[PDB]
Amino acid sequence: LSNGFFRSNTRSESYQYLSNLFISNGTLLDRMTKTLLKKRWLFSDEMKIGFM
Amino acid sequence: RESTMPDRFRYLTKEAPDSPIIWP
């Protein structure tokens, strides 16, 4: 299995990019998970409103 | 009480009244 280390590094770069992107938008996920915490359901309308 | 019904769809669970036919 010589093809088990390419996919690991591909997912590693994907995770690194996702972390670097989520760091800048940390407030977005913060207010979003708080909104999910108070209001027990979360649709696309509340989703796009909370994207502000 | 405790349920799994979203607050947006609560008002949709009631029956509205209706005006009687005014003309007769």
What would the 3-class secondary structure string for chain B be?
CCCCCCHHHCHHHCCCCCCCCCCC
Residue B12 at interface with chain A, using a CB cutoff of 8 Å: no
Residue A42: closest C-alpha in chain B? B6
Structure tokens at A14: 């994907």
Please tell me what resolution, in angstroms, this structure has: 3.2
Experimental method: cryo-EM
Half-sphere exposure of residue A14: CA atoms within 13 angstroms, side-chain side: 6
- All residues at 6 or more sequence positions from B5 whose CB lies less than 8 Å from its CB, including other chains: B13
Give A26→chain B minimum CA distance, Å.
27
Per the CB < 8 A criterion, the answer to whether B8 and A41 are in contact is yes
The two most distant CA atoms of chain B are separated, in Å, by 47
Taking each helix axis from N to C terminus, what angle separates A6-24 and A26-38, rounded to the nearest 10 degrees? 80
Half-sphere exposure of residue B18: CA atoms within 13 angstroms, side-chain side: 3
